[PDB]
């Protein structure tokens, strides 16, 4: 299918206790492959997936220097932000960024992303056409104009449509044995009291990759959201994911229900009953 | 491959 590469960065200022802490992580689809932490001793970009271990010493220097530059860029962007919002030099603030690209199965560019957040709120974002910007407030509007006047979008689109795509494409080949692996959910069901009248049925999907999964409940072949609870998909820690879906049913009427599990790792969807 | 940061100034 199609694929993604994303980087997520987090700068947290701490006035009076040194420079902002900067953390960046890289992902390919659902698999994390690199990290940098400005508080950690190495001062290096580091591997977090086995397939990226193939990269030579110059790749690690190159990525190290680029992520440390981002570190510096966001250190300055925090100071600017403070002035824009006229905030005091006392408090901690957070500058977050996300960027990356998607490619189709052919390996061709599908979409690119380049966006900022300040204290948990959208700040500015590159629009889908990779040529224009969306500012979320008056402060961000200053930045938008700055970037439009300087035609900054072009350099960003160039990265997204080129370097980003070539990188993703490369990682996908180097790590095909895992990144292009499919891992089917292993399913089962639990059953719990709740009360005098009703029990809960929980449908489990375990050890599946990629995260993308659909779990739905049905009563007599008719689906139900009415008394349905669907938890966040969660990491198992071994590179695979877990998720469950639950319904509340009348006690003694459990066989009336079925759970349906769709996942691209499945020849055909699975159907479970208590 | 990390991007460069030219043009990223608020």
């Amino acid at each position: 299918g199609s694929h993604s590469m994303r980087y997520f960065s987090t700068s947290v200022s701490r006035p009076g206790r040194g420079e902002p802490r900067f953390i960046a992580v890289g992902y390919v689809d659902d698999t994390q492959f690199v990290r940098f932490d400005s508080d950690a001793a190495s001062q290096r970009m580091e591997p977090r997936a086995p397939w990226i271990e193939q990269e030579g010493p110059e790749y690690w220097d190159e990525e190290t220097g680029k992520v440390k530059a981002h570190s510096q860029t966001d250190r300055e962007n925090l100071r600017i932000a403070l002035r824009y919002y006229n905030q005091s030099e006392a408090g901690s603030h957070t500058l977050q960024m996300m960027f990356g690209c998607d490619v189709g199965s052919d390996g061709r560019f599908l979409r690119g992303y380049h966006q900022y957040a300040y204290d948990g709120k959208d700040y500015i974002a590159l629009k889908e056409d990779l040529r224009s910007w969306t500012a979320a407030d008056m402060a961000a509007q200053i930045t938008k104009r700055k970037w439009e006047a300087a035609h900054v979008a072009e350099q960003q689109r160039a990265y997204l449509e080129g370097t980003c795509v070539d990188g993703l494409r490369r990682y996908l080949e180097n790590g095909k044995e895992t990144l292009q692996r499919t891992d089917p959910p292993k399913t089962h069901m639990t059953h719990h009291p709740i009360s005098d009248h009703e029990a809960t049925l929980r449908c489990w999907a375990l050890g599946f990759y990629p995260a993308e999964i659909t779990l739905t409940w049905q009563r007599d072949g008719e689906d139900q959201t009415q008394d349905t609870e669907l938890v966040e998909t969660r990491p198992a820690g071994d590179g695979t994911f877990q998720k469950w879906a639950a319904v509340v049913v009348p006690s003694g009427e459990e066989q009336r229900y079925t759970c349906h599990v769709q996942h691209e790792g499945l020849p055909k969807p699975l159907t479970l009953r208590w | 491959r990390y991007p460069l940061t030219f043009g990223w100034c608020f």
């Epitope: 190159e62 220097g65 689109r157 990265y159 | 460069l4 043009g7």
Partner: T-cell receptor, first 113, second 112 residues
Amino acid sequence: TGVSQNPRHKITKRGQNVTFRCDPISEHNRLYWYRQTLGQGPEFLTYFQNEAQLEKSRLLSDRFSAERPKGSFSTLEIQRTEQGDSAMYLCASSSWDTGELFFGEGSRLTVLE
Amino acid sequence: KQEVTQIPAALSVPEGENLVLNCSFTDSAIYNLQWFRQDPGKGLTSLLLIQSSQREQTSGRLNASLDKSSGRSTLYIAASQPGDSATYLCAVRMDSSYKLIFGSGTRLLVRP
């Protein structure tokens, strides 16, 4: 207006220490150091973003150190100069958006025995 | 292992000639390219900058083109004047680094 380097000329004796200064273009984001010998291209020494020295040439001598303590102006120091140090030392700075490098006049070093 | 070569190393021409100054690089993962002029004993004057996205750039009698796939960049000088006499430096920035990487230059003489 542009990049300002001092001293423009320096003649020294082998074993002596020299210091070169660069005053980049106002609020230019990055400052770069280069070295150039006769009829050759500039070779990279080191660079700063603000006051962070983020990349230095792996061939850079132990005797060479740079700093840009406030951002703004930068300092390049050579300890115990050798005739091989003799070269044109070039300072440049780039803007936040373009990355276009603008160079100073250069600081021309001759180390005599 | 990026190698920037400049073609040719030196050039003597009659005034008014249309000139081709070539620059090639072995690695095409280029962020941008920059052209410089250098006059003996002096520093570098910035002439043209071409970004990865852009294909050409012009300033008066100067036109620079760029072909990333080819690994090639040409600087055209129209109507060469004796005043163009200088060393012309080609430099590239990698996608992977902030520094500029220089060629050795083309030494140009335009004869009056």
